[PDB]
């Protein structure tokens, strides 16, 4: 019975409802992030359920303020919620401190909010995991947040179904390029890793989506990868995919 | 009777008990000791996945200029306690005109936990907090609190799965020395002692990226960096 | 605060049960005074009975009540009682009529019965009081919030027993000195312990001495109980 | 928390169970004559050594021309009464005319109804017989209200334990062509009915008569006894 | 219910056949003391709008903050943030007008006078005013404070009616605005010599000139003036 | 009380509807000469004064409604319905539209910020200039439908079926009166007399009129005769 | 959770209260002995490891300069109760009459707190029982015991927790109404020794008394109406000095 | 066990209540939506409970440039459309800006979500097809009570929707190009709604059509005016 | 002190003919002795064959007009596109104005 109400600790000290939330997460699309040399890239798998979908429209990545990028996997709506609050939490920081919210700061804000939903049985934890980050006064930052409200900083991160395939690919990158990775490179790379990771869901045609926040490529602001730059990576992935 | 913090027929609070187990979920061990004029807390640092940014993994926190706190328990619950410990410490200063003392801060935190213990809607937090500092009145200090709302001060202490072994080791030292503190003038050595006696009890050698040290002296608390630790680790590889 | 398929209030019914396990209190309404007596629950050689007050409480200079149930639940109800008393006095400058105070206290209890979700109060009261409209009165209120007035009554442990003993010896023209005796007798025969001793009793009266005009409430002191005991012959 | 809720069969258990408490309560009855209404009730006998002088009587004045009696949890009634009394004055104060029995009833009814669809409150364990006369009118009024909140008028009606039995007595002993055209006979009839359940008892029955223009009076233990006797006679004479 | 402290004077502006020009000095006065000299009072919002504000500065600085957030918040979940669904001058105005009218209706006004000058996506020039009372109006030229008394008369000489707008070149308009700014330096005690001008043209987009100075001033004649009546020397 | 079933229905709402099936039959029929509303009284004894049973109420001069189910629940609903027509007359100096009125009532229904749904349904019949004579049925779900004729309550199953047969886009007020009477008779356990059934109608010219027992009896009789034909 | 967690069971018991009473029963023993010119309350400093520091755990607390409290049950529940007790001492009293409340009154207030826990929605009773000792100009010396039910009653001497019965028994034989403070201390010590498992000395025991006024503990000389607090906690040294006289 | 509220994830990470809510949709009549690059149509097959009632209105106008078709629990649709009307209104009044369809979508999602994360609440049980013309062309959005919103060239929802969904899934290349001519787009819209029929053919009371586009404000064509589309 | 009110002059005139009505207004908008605009309409079409002008303090005139136009919008909503008759419109405005009686 220890898994019917949220705030309940089981005899082994686990909060089951949280872990179940995690399952909702696993059952979703894959997404990743690659902290690069002076920025971060985000990418996610948009599953095309039907020809009836208007192409490149149901955007899933989201921006917070102007320098933070957010992407998450799971119950989509739960993600949006997490982002709206992010936005309110970021505005509030700016209004009072003038400088846009530092990533470490922002993450913790999102952290504390989610953790709060594992404190009362009147609430269900969040059915999503979020990868987000950006550039600030001192470096790029990439974080991932799980339904327990647990979060940490990453070199690369991914989540959703293609999670393991993706992590594998990321692990390669870290060992092969400890120096860093140009934003351009990381872009294509993410495109790839998503393509690869797509195999754990190898049954439906997909639409890639990438975004980046780079100190030399986008001035520290979060922009979406579109046009020439997007196609380049789509092909770079279609290449090394065989 | 086993879902909310009410009493069980034997007069027990199960949810409180299970929260004590979650404190071990992380599998980290830590210890704190007091020097002549400082305080050290070592905690193992364990970074599994290679994709993690090692620098962001810590269970040791800077609560205020003078108070450092180490947590044994899951991170969410841990950070929750931190923020509050931080907030409270500040408020205390604004309203009373001097920095919140570590013990007072521990007591305050303990009282807050007790409430989760007594009200059904609040789940306890699965974490244990050791607050260390060199109090302007009391001197080097270590105060630890738990999910039951219990809090108390220690000559030295340890927390983690291998708590019992560490404690005995320390218990022995102080029983041999007769004093309630490491008799060393510089924190460096105390840190050394601390790590030495940690290795001595866990039966494991440590590298620089496997520890986490926090030191507190008169007017400041700081966490050493890998390099700093290394200078320690090196120096110990001479006595042993 | 819910109904049983039979049409009863669980928590209320159960409350009354808790009460039946409480010491016995008796209130006997004489023609020139009222007596209240109560047998104390759980004692010892070490309990200080001298400076004690656990079953007999003064509400107003003209109304006293005897308690059967949770001492703590009682005190809450009492304090508010004492307050309604004073409010009425301020508003009208006349002491509050017993029934008014009693009915008010009842209404609170009933509240716990009908809404909120809070456990009722584990208490029953015997009110001994005087007023210029009906003279001496004896009242009783229980957890359902119901109240009624008596010539003699008891609450707590062994009601049927005592109630039956009172119904037997009581007579319309009684006198305090006699009611005191009766009270003692009844308690004496309905105790659950060896023998009635001063240290286990709480006794009090509300008489209107002929050599004056205002009613005098006398809460008996330990020695006096020991004395009133010898006389009645419980020895 | 929603206590009074629907069940798979379309019932609000708490309300339904509320009625049970009504049945457990003593009996109360009222029949209306040609220029009067009477209400009789049987007295509770769980324990006896009562001080009749003070004990909260069963029939209460809502206003100088309207009374109410009930059957159910004695406590729950008091509230209904207060709310009714207070509303009686308020109507006077703002409409410059005392309540009509109907209005008062509809007021009391709505109060109960409300408790059946409000969270954290259990329905009232009570049914009331409200009677009296409209201001500057002579046509007698008798109304009935139940925990559901439903209400209506009755030439005669009863509630409380064994109400079914006495209801029957009335169903045939009261004809809507010659309503008890005298205080005396209306009383008789009520007593007669009451006897069928009360079980030969003087202090067991209390009878209250209500006449036009604030003329209300409760009969003393003995005035009733006289009726009892004359009734046992019109029984023994056969 | 307040009283302005540090303040900024007139903001002049007018519309020409292909866009709008607006200008305002760079002074923040503390009563009669010309305290702050580096105060920009034209706030460009995007690539098609400039908001000129006079009145209390602290309140202007707030309106600034508010405008930035408007931009930021418009980007949110808006893939067309820099195209079809970007902020139009008209949207910005309405927001502002509304705020002003609410603050006054709550008796805690934004002690200001603002002119929103810009060009709409379809080409239409946009020029509209709103003040601490929520009063709003539009016209070929607009000016607040002294500019209203002095600048409008001059500017209206170029554009008296709507039909005159399509007959006016940027050269002309810009010249006018600059002259007006010069007049105000002469006649307005709270003016400052250095100003800022911005043109929003339906082709060149937004041009924002900073650090301009009033030049070509006639003062030589002040030598032939002595006394205030009968003094000969 | 806000829990969905595996079938996708709200429990308390479904149950609420069952309680309604236990109530007196209410029938309304909508013509081009008016709308008739008739109900079955159903006295729990013959001591009860049949006239103190209110199941057809006037909401406003051009709107009346019949009820069925736990009738006490309907008090607040009528109150609100009245207040709303009135308020609408106050703010707009005109008659509220039957639909609007109804919608206003339903708007109240789903407010599950009252422990349970209403255990009662209504037949709101009325007339307004733009949509003529209209009949509406309002359910505790919060949903409402317009019908040409409709029956609710215990005997609604058979009644609805019979309505389906008797209704055509061209009856006269009298006709419908009879049918309601008829169908009332067909589903009433007791025999239809003027002390246990109630008819009412609403017309452009005279508005909402509840028929006086006497007029009803004349129709009941007029019915017995027309029925005992073949 | 706005409903009472402590409800009435069919036998007529308040589940949670009895359970809380059980928790109390398992706590370390504490005693109070009321003499003629004083009262003593003591307990044992159950060190849960020799690494912890004994002093940093006041099991015995000053509520007002003339009233102390000791407990048995869950320490945390006690700690917060002492806070609230000291508080109400001021709010409901020192801020209205300029003097601290009398023992029975404070006791009464504390009780009120615990009762609320017994009936307010969403909480559990306090798992503690306190022995509160004090003195006041009009009622003299008194000792009270307060339970999770809220019930309180005075004693000449008593003990609670673990060895309550044995202890009460020993107290019952040694107590008489002519006891001078030192003696009750003696008895407190003696009674304590039998329930104490290991080392019995000034660092494992905690005695506090309520007696004559201590001017030396006031902090200032000048105003002569208040001669000092009556509550004084015993020092390790003072305790041992007495132990040595076993 | 795990389907008591929405605050409970099952062991496989599902929210049954939400899911059950989604099932409420399937028991509603089919409603189709389809757009070209200049228009958006909403063809909604209305439903009847008996042969004497109204075919429940499935189309609601939310602003002169936007509207939606509902399938499921009407009440909820009212609540949701109304919220949509307000937000459209707020954009007009405060920014003199027409609310972007995508933006409206973001709003409904956010609204639905709150009802799928808190104790005591209940997910909304109704689906909606929102069409609207704006600064970026014609739009069609499908809204599901789970909180998910998707932009589509066409679709349909409700009982047997899957029929029309394939028709459109193939007819895309054909309708995405019906620019400058609304009649055709509607025809297609009807042709689509018919591949999810079974009961009978779409009638003059069955049909409900809504169109909006370049030089055409959201208009509701009910009954008579749809005659030429069967 | 802050004065929440102002005057923008202007003059309007409504005349009702046997089967038509006119609402005329000058176009000038002023403040004190300055002309704020030579062209700022003040008589508007509120839809439903209703013209209205709120002349006096322009801000209030503006707000009122907006609230009314909007009131027309909602009326159509809550009452199946029913045309708002002039008299109904009138009673409505009474309420709008009176809502701000203080
Ligand atoms: Mg993992
Ligand atoms: Mg809790
Ligand atoms: Mg809880
Ligand atoms: Mg009209």
């Amino acid at each position: 019975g220890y898994d019917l109400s949220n705030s309940v600790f089981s005899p082994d000290g686990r909060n089951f409802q949280v872990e179940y939330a995690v399952k909702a997460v696993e059952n979703g699309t894959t997404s990743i992030g690659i902290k690069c040399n002076d920025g971060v890239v985000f990418a996610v798998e948009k599953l095309i359920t039907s020809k009836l979908l208007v192409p490149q429209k149901n955007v899933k990545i989201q921006v917070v303020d102007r320098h933070i990028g957010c992407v998450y996997s799971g119950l989509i709506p739960d993600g949006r919620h997490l982002v709206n609050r992010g936005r309110e939490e970021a505005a509030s920081f700016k209004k009072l401190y003038k400088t846009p919210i530092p990533i470490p700061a922002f993450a913790d804000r999102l952290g504390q909010y989610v953790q709060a939903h594992t404190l009362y049985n009147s609430v269900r934890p969040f059915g999503v995991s979020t990868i987000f980050g950006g550039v600030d006064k001192n470096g790029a930052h990439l974080y991932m947040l799980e339904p327990s409200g647990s979060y940490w900083g990453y070199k690369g991160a991914a989540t959703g179904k293609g999670r393991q395939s993706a992590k594998a690919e990321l692990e390669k990158l870290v060992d092969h390029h400890p120096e860093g990775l140009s934003a351009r490179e990381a872009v294509k790379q993410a495109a790839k890793i998503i393509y690869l990771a797509h195999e754990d869901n190898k049954e439906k045609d997909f639409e890639l989506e990438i975004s980046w926040c780079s100190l030399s490529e986008t001035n520290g602001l979060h922009k979406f990868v579109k046009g020439d730059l997007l196609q380049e990576a789509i092909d770079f992935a279609q290449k090394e995919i065989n | 009777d086993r879902h909310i913090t009410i009493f069980s027929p034997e007069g027990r609070l199960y949810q409180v008990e299970y929260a004590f187990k979650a404190t071990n979920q992380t599998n980290i061990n830590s210890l704190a000791v007091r020097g002549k004029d400082c305080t050290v807390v070592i905690s193992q640092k364990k970074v599994p996945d290679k994709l993690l940014d090692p620098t962001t993994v810590s269970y040791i926190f800077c609560i205020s200029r003078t108070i450092g706190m180490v947590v044994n328990g899951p991170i969410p619950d841990a950070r929750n306690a931190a923020l509050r410990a931080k907030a409270e410490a500040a408020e205390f200063r604004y309203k009373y005109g001097y920095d919140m003392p570590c013990d007072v801060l521990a007591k305050r935190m303990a009282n807050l936990s007790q409430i989760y213990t007594q009200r059904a809607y609040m789940r306890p937090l699965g974490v244990i907090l050791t607050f260390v500092s060199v109090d302007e009145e009391l001197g080097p200090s270590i105060y630890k609190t738990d999910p039951a709302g219990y809090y108390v001060g220690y000559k030295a202490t340890a927390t983690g799965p291998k708590q019992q072994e560490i404690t005995t080791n320390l218990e022995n030292h102080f029983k041999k020395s007769k004093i309630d503190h490491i008799n060393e003038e510089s924190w460096e050595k105390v840190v050394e002692f601390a790590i030495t006696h940690m290795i001595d009890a866990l039966g494991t050698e440590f590298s620089k990226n496997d520890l986490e040290v926090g030191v507190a002296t008169k007017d400041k608390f700081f966490t050493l960096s890998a390099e700093n630790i290394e200078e320690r680790l090196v120096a110990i590889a001479e006595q042993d | 605060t819910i109904f049983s398929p039979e049409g009863r209030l669980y928590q209320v019914e159960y409350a009354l049960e808790s009460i039946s396990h409480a010491g016995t209190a008796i209130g006997i309404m004489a023609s020139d005074g009222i007596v209240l007596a109560a047998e104390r629950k759980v004692t010892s050689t070490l309990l200080e009975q001298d400076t004690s007050t656990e079953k007999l409480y003064k509400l107003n200079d003209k109304i006293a009540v005897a308690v059967a149930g949770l001492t703590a639940d009682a005190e809450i109800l009492i304090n508010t009682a004492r307050i309604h008393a004073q409010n009425y006095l301020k508003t009208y400058n006349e002491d509050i009529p017993v029934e008014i105070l009693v009915r008010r206290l009842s209404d609170i209890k009933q509240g716990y019965t009908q809404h909120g979700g809070l456990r009722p109060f584990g208490v029953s009261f015997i009110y001994a009081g005087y007023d210029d409209r009906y003279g001496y009165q004896l009242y009783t209120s229980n957890p359902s919030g119901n109240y009624t007035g008596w010539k003699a009554i008891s609450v707590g442990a062994n009601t049927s027993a005592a109630q039956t003993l009172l119904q037997m010896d009581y007579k319309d023209d009684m006198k305090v000195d006699d009611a005191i005796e009766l009270a003692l007798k009844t308690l004496s025969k309905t105790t659950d312990s060896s023998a009635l001793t001063y240290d286990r009793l709480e006794f009090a009266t509300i008489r209107k001495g002929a050599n004056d005009g205002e009613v005098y409430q006398k809460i008996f002191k330990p020695q006096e109980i020991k004395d009133i005991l010898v006389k009645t012959g419980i020895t | 928390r929603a206590l009074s809720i629907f069940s798979p069969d379309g019932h609000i258990f708490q309300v339904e169970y509320a009625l049970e408490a009504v049945k457990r309560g003593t009996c109360a009855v009222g029949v209306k004559g040609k220029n009067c209404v009477v209400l009789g009730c049987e007295r509770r006998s769980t324990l006896k050594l009562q001080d009749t002088r003070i004990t909260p009587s069963k029939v209460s004045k809502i206003d100088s021309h309207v009374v109410l009696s009930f059957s159910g949890l004695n406590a729950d009634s008091r509230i209904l009464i207060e709310k009714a009394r207070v509303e009686a004055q308020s109507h006077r104060l703002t409409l410059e005319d005392p309540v009509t029995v109907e209005y008062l009833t509809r007021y009391v009814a709505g109060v109960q109804q409300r408790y059946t669809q409000s969270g954290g409150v259990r329905p009232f364990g009570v049914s009331t017989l409200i009677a009296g006369f409209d201001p500057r009118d002579d046509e007698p009024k008798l109304y009935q209200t139940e925990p559901s909140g439903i209400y209506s008028s009755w030439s005669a009606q009863t509630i409380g334990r064994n109400s079914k039995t006495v209801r029957e007595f009335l169903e045939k002993n009261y004809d809507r062509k010659e309503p008890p055209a005298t205080v005396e006979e209306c009383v008789k009839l009520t007593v007669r009915s009451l006897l069928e359940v009360v079980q030969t008892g003087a202090k067991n029955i209390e009878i209250t008569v209500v006449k036009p223009d604030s003329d209300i009076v409760a009969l003393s233990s003995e005035e009733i006894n006289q009726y009892v006797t004359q009734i046992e006679q019109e029984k023994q004479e056969q | 219910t307040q009283q302005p402290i540090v303040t900024g004077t007139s903001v002049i502006s007018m519309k020409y056949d292909n866009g709008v020009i607006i200008a305002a000095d760079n002074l923040g006065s503390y009563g009669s003391l010309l305290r702050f000299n580096g105060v920009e009072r034209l706030i460009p919002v995007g690539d098609n709008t400039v908001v000129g504000i006079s009145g209390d500065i602290s309140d202007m600085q707030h309106i600034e903050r508010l405008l930035k957030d408007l931009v930021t918040e418009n980007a949110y979940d808006n893939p067309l943030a820099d195209a079809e669904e970007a902020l139009e001058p008209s949207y910005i105005f309405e927001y502002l007008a509304t705020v002003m009218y609410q603050r006054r209706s709550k008796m805690n006004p934004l002690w200001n006078a603002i002119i929103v000058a810009g060009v709409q996506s379809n080409g239409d020039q946009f020029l509209r005013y709103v003040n601490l009372l929520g009063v709003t109006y539009s016209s070929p030229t607009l000016a607040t404070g002294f500019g209203a008394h002095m600048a409008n008369p001059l500017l209206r000489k170029v554009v008296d009616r709507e039909s005159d707008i399509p007959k006016t070149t940027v050269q002309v308009a810009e010249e006018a605005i600059v002259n007006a700014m010069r007049v105000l330096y002469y006649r307005d005690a709270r003016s400052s010599r250095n100003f800022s001008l911005a043109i929003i043209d339906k082709n060149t987009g937004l041009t924002f000139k900073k650090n301009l100075q009033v030049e070509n001033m006639k003062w030589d004649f002040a030598k032939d003036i002595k006394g205030y009546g009968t003094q000969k020397i | 009380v806000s829990t969905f079933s595996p079938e996708g229905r709200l429990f308390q709402v479904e149950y609420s509807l069952e309680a309604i099936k236990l109530g007196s039959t209410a029938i309304g029929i909508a013509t081009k000469e008016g709308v008739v509303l008739g109900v079955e009284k159903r006295a729990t004894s013959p001591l009860l004064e049949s006239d103190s049973i209110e199941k057809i109420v006037e909401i406003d001069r051009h709107i009346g409604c019949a009820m069925s189910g736990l009738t006490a629940d309907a008090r607040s609903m009528i109150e609100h319905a009245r207040t709303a027509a009135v308020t609408h007359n106050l703010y707009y100096d005109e008659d509220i539209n039957v639909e609007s009125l109804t919608q206003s009532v339903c708007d109240l229904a789903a407010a599950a910020a009252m422990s349970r749904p209403f255990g009662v349904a209504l037949l709101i019949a009325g007339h307004d200039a733009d949509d003529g004579y209209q009949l509406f049925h309002a359910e505790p779900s919060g949903t409402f439908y317009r019908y040409n004729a409709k029956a609710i309550g215990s005997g609604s199953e058979g009644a609805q079926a019979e309505l389906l047969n008797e209704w055509h886009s061209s009856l006269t007020l009298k006709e419908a009166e009879l049918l309601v009477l008829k169908i009332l008779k067909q589903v009433m356990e007791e025999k239809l007399d003027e002390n246990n059934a109630q008819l009412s109608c609403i017309t452009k010219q005279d508005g909402f009129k509840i028929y006086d027992n006497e007029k009803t009896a004349e129709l009941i009789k007029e019915l017995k005769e027309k029925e005992a034909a073949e | 959770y706005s409903f009472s967690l402590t409800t009435f069971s069919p036998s007529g018991k308040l589940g949670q209260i009895d359970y809380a009473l059980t928790a109390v029963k398992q706590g370390v023993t504490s005693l109070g002995i009321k003499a003629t010119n004083g009262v003593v309350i003591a307990t044992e400093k159950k060190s849960s490891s020799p690494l912890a520091m004994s002093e940093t755990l006041s099991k015995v607390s000053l509520l007002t300069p003339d009233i102390g409290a000791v407990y048995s049950g869950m320490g945390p529940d006690y700690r917060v109760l002492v806070d609230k007790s000291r508080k109400v001492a001021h709010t409901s009293y020192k801020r209205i009459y300029g003097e601290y409340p009398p023992t029975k009154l404070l006791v009464s207030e504390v009780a009120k707190i615990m009762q609320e826990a017994t009936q307010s929605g969403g909480v559990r009773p306090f798992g503690v029982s306190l022995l509160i000792a004090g003195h006041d100009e009009f009622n003299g010396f008194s000792l009270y015991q307060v339970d999770p039910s809220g019930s309180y009653f005075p004693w000449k001497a008593t003990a609670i927790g673990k060895g309550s019965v044995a202890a009460k028994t020993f107290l019952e034989k040694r107590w008489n109404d002519e006891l001078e403070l030192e003696d009750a201390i003696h008895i407190a010590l003696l009674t304590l020794k039998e329930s104490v498992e290991g080392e019995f000395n000034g660092d494992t025991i905690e005695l506090a008394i309520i007696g004559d006024e201590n001017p030396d503990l006031l902090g200032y000389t000048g105003i002569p109406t208040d001669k000092g607090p009556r509550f004084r906690k015993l020092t390790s040294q003072e305790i041992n000095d007495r132990l040595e006289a076993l | 066990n795990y389907d008591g509220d929405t605050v409970t994830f099952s062991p496989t990470g599902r929210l049954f209540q939400v899911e059950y809510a989604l099932e409420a949709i399937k028991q509603g009549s089919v409603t189709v939506g389809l757009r070209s690059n200049t228009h958006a149509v909403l063809v909604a097959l209305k439903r009847n409970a008996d042969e004497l009632s109204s075919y429940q209105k499935k189309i609601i106008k939310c602003d002169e440039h936007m509207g939606l078709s509902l399938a499921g629990l009407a009440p909820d649709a009212r609540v949701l459309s109304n919220y949509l009307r307000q937000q459209c209104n707020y954009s007009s009044l405060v920014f003199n800006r027409k609310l972007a369809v995508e933006r409206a979508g973001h709003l409904l999602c956010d609204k639905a979500q709150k009802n799928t994360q808190s104790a005591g609440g209940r997910p909304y049980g109704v689906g909606l097809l929102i069409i609207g013309y704006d600064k970026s062309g014609a739009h069609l959005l499908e809204f599901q009570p789970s909180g998910n919103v998707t932009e589509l060239y066409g679709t349909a929802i409700g009982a047997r929707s899957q029929g029309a969904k394939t028709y459109l899934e193939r007819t895309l290349d054909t309708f995405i190009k019906i620019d400058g001519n609304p009649d055709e787009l509607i025809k297609a819209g009807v042709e689509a709604i018919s591949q999810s029929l079974r009961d009978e053919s779409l009638t003059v009371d069955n049909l409900s059509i809504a169109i909006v586009g370049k030089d055409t404000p959201f208009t509701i064509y009910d009954g008579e005016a749809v005659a030429k589309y069967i | 002190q802050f004065n929440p009110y102002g005057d923008n002059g202007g003059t309007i005139l409504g005349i009702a003919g046997e089967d038509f009505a006119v609402l005329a207004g000058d176009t000038r908008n002023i403040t004190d002795y300055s002309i704020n605009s030579r062209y700022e309409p003040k008589v508007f079409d509120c839809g439903d064959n209703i013209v209205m002008s709120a002349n006096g303090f322009a801000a209030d005139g503006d707000a009122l007009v907006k609230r009314f136009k909007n009131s027309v919008k909602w009326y159509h909503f809550d009452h199946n596109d029913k045309k708002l008759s002039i008299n109904s419109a009138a009673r409505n405005i009474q309420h709008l104005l009176y809502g701000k009686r203080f």
Side-chain angles (χ1 to χ4, degrees), chain B residues 65-145:
Chain B
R65 181 66 102 269
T66 48
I67 292 183
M69 134 167 135
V70 66
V71 178
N72 285 106
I75 200 62
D77 286 23
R79 283 163 178 166
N80 179 117
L83 181 50
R84 184 86 189 231
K86 283 174 176 187
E88 292 275 345
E91 190 186 76
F92 186 91
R93 176 66 172 82
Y94 169 62
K95 299 166 59 175
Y96 301 96
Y98 65 109
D99 314 299
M100 171 136 65
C102 145
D103 52 281
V104 174
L105 169 58
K107 173 172 178 172
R108 173 75 188 140
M109 293 303 274
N111 291 181
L112 240 24
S113 292
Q114 186 282 162
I115 301 180
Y116 313 149
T117 275
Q118 183 155 207
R119 306 196 102 109
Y121 76 110
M122 293 295 251
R123 82 166 164 70
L125 284 176
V127 300
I128 298 184
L129 324 173
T130 301
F131 292 104
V132 290
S133 74
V134 181
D135 191 81
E136 50 179 336
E137 310 199 43
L138 303 181
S141 294
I142 309 168
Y143 285 75
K144 195 162 72 180
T145 69

Side-chain angles (χ1 to χ4, degrees), chain B residues 11-13 15-16 97 100 105:
Chain B
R12 286 162 63 172
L13 295 157
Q15 286 291 306
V16 165
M100 171 136 65
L105 169 58

